[PDB]
Design a binder for this molecule. Sequence first.
Ligand code: CLA
Ligand code: DD6
Ligand code: DD6
Ligand code: SF4
Ligand code: SF4
Lengths: 166, 37, 199, 217, 80, 73, 62
Amino acid sequence: EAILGLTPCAESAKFQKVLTKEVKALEKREKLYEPGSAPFQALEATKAKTQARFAKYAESGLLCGADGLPHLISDPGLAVKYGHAGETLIPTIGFLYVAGYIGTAGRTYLQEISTRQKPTQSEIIIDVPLATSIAFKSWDWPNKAVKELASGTLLEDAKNVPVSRR
Amino acid sequence: MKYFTTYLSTAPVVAVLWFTLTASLLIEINRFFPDIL
Amino acid sequence: RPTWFPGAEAPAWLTGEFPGDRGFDPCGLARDPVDFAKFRDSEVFHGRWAMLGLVGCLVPEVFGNLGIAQLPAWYDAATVANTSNLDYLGNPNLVHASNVSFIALSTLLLMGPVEAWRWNGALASEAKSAERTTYPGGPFDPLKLGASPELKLKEIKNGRLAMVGMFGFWAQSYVTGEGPLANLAAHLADPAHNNLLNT
Amino acid sequence: KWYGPNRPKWLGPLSGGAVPEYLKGEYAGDYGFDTAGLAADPKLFQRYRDAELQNGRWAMLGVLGCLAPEVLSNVFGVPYPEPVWFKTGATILNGGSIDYLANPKLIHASNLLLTLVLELVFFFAAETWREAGEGPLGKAQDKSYPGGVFDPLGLSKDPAAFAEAKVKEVKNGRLAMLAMLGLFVQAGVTGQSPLENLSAHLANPGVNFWTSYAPTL
Amino acid sequence: SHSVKIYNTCIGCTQCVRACPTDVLEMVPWDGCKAGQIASSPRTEDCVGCKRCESACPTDFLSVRVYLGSETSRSMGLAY
Amino acid sequence: VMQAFGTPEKQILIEPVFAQWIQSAHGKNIYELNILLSSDSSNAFSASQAIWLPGWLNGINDKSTSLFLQIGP
Amino acid sequence: AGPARGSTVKVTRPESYWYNQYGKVISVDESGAIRYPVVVRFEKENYQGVTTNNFALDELEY
Ligand code: CLA
Ligand SMILES: CC1=C(C#C/C(C)=C/C=C/C(C)=C/C=C/C=C(C)/C=C/C=C(C)/C=C/[C@@]23O[C@]2(C)C[C@@H](O)CC3(C)C)C(C)(C)C[C@H](O)C1
Ligand SMILES: CC1=C(C#C/C(C)=C/C=C/C(C)=C/C=C/C=C(C)/C=C/C=C(C)/C=C/[C@@]23O[C@]2(C)C[C@@H](O)CC3(C)C)C(C)(C)C[C@H](O)C1
Ligand code: SF4
Ligand code: SF4
């Protein structure tokens, strides 16, 4: 469905122009080699991939501009109403899960070693068992996050936080 | 080997190893499932 | 004590000193006794605006049917003022207002002082005390009668009814697409097949 | 059905060595079943207890909500567009609306993302109050068993009846969880409604089984 | 000239005095600390402003403090 | 790197939809969004004593003027 | 009163690196002439690279 003045890539002539332009370049390169030789095969693999890629973009409801290149929709309302949520909105959730995981693993390891005798030695020599255990137990990180938040164990109190003369 | 694993546990070795695996994984995904936009 | 539900036990903070108490506060919004006095004013205030708003919304339909004037419908007046002129009681020489933004500005400019004065407890720029007014008297009570707890309960009760009524008017107008008395007429005609649950 | 050291157990009469030590019959639904040792840490055991009750109660409302609009369409003539549970949802897609009791003057909802966002926001509030154990609706008596507004009939006032009813709740919960897991797998395998699945096994006890689908794998 | 001031947090370690390259500071007797000596700055006309003393001082926010001011040929470190 | 490897179709080209919405509300009809001044039926458009609007809309939908330039990635 | 040797204090001197932080008491001086009698040791070194400092009683919370 054409929105925001954009055409769907599946029914855009400029899209086809682009595909033609890439495939023609590859043909020109192929002229130099012999139809059985291994460079030839490489250029054929390249061309195959190329045509496949354009076909994929065509059956994905991507939206082309005047340049004939696909454009992404980032307002979540527009994305969900017109079937474009896979462009930005799903990746959002995907990034925020993995970033929360990495944070949780890092915070966890740091809070664990902080109770050791020399905690700074465990920062330059990683406790690898401890780190692997933390990395694999941290797949359900919102458990820990919402617990820490609602309980109050997420934030240090202001009285315990070093601060300047203000 | 008696302290070789502790050497492998040091930060730049663990970093090189972890990035190498993480990079390798992303390369292999981008071999199998290319051109995700 | 009379309560909103058979046998239902009242909160601790709802004791029965104030008119309209039926021990109704599931969401615990009047735990803080400082907020409870504000809410009490807000309840009566919302009530009085709902009563005036209900009467003022029935008036176009009634005045239409009794052959007094062809007033716009309550959900049409802003459209009328926006596209054409709003002439009082039909009469094109009365008021004859044409611009919705000047109506809105006027509404803020007239209701600003009045609202501040109400809150401040006097015609002054600073509140007299930490207490809400809600029952002024003086010029606002010309017939010299009132502020009895029975009458207060009568106000509260009619208010609450009108606020539920006003919610009705909004939803009705959206759904049925016609005026409120028309909706009553429709239900009074054939009640089994002119209602919400029949489609 | 009971508590204590001589309660019903999960291997019945043959349940001598089948009980771990940390399950001493203090909490509802202790049949001494924990073969993977998940509850050996007692903080983890408190967590899991809350989780088993959250999954259970949600599973109960779920199974009732997956069956009820199909039943209403079957028994009564309520004209739901796609009344099956795994087909509901798609009704709000395209240009279609969601009308409660198939009446287009009831919710008439057409904006999927507005629906979802309202749900997440409401839940972010209510779940944060749940986890804290204090909120607008009051302070909880126990994290899993709040009481107050949540118990308006006062059925938790009697101690012994409360102790029994905890065992009723956890056992209905477990059943409902197995029901819901049933619904999911049935839809995944048979592709038909779960009332049609029941009708098919009521009509014919025989071949109409999981062992009509098993040969195809 | 620069101005060098000594505050009462001094612990009389003598490190600033040792550090100074133009003999501005000396240790005089005092009773405010266990070492029974404080630093002092009599010859501030000879201070070049290097702040070596403040680098030497071990108290938390220094007890010796150099406030740079007006330049002279002495403070500007000129051999011409 | 997409341009360098000869694959301009794999660029990330996010549309500025929030600025295009604002432009649509001001009266630009190039984004087919039909709101406020770009809808004929709105209160904002049909405000009787508007009267600056014909001039304004002529201006905002003329490529020569720089009155709200068209925008993209 | 003084803190006990070995006890934990919180610094309340605003110009200090260790403000709002906790240290161990190592020594208290008993003379009244001394202006900063309490010696405190911290785990985190300051910008100078030292880990110890003298304090008065009115700069500690014990
Ligand atoms: C446990 C690791 C961890 C966590 C949970 C955080 C969390 C945060 N950082 Mg910090 N930070 C970290 C490490 C961490 N950081 C490191 C290692 C550096 C040095 C490069 C920084 C440098 C830094 C700066 C300059 C800023 C932040 C800021 C922030 C805050 C906002 C988010 C952000 O800006 O991310 C950005 C994160 C980075 C730029 C650093 C990348 C962190 C890596 C990818 C993850 C940790 C790596 C670690 C080695 C994992 C080992 C775990 C294993 C042994 C189990 C957030 C509180 C910002 C802030 O103050 O917000 C108010 C801010 O300006 N961080
Ligand atoms: C108390 C409580 C709770 C509650 C509650 C509930 C149910 C609250 C509900 C409140 C509700 C339902 C409040 C309505 C207001 C209506 C008003 C003010 C209308 C004015 C309307 C006016 C002034 C209209 C004016 C005009 O129409 C006129 C006259 C002519 C038209 O041409 C023009 C316009 C339209 C401008 C909880 C949350 C359940 C639990 C908690 O623990 C305790
Ligand atoms: C105890 C134990 C063990 C165990 C175990 C076991 C057997 C665990 C099993 C857990 C299981 C099976 C848990 C399912 C929950 C399902 C839920 C929450 C369903 C909700 C459903 C809801 C809320 C929603 C339903 C709907 O949205 C749907 C779907 C579609 C919509 O159209 C309609 C509605 C909105 C109504 C081990 C591991 C074996 C050994 C160890 O040692 C000890
Ligand atoms: S600044 Fe340099 S010259 Fe001056 S007192 Fe300090 S050490 Fe001595
Ligand atoms: S000023 Fe600092 S460096 Fe100089 S003696 Fe005193 S404590 Fe030691």
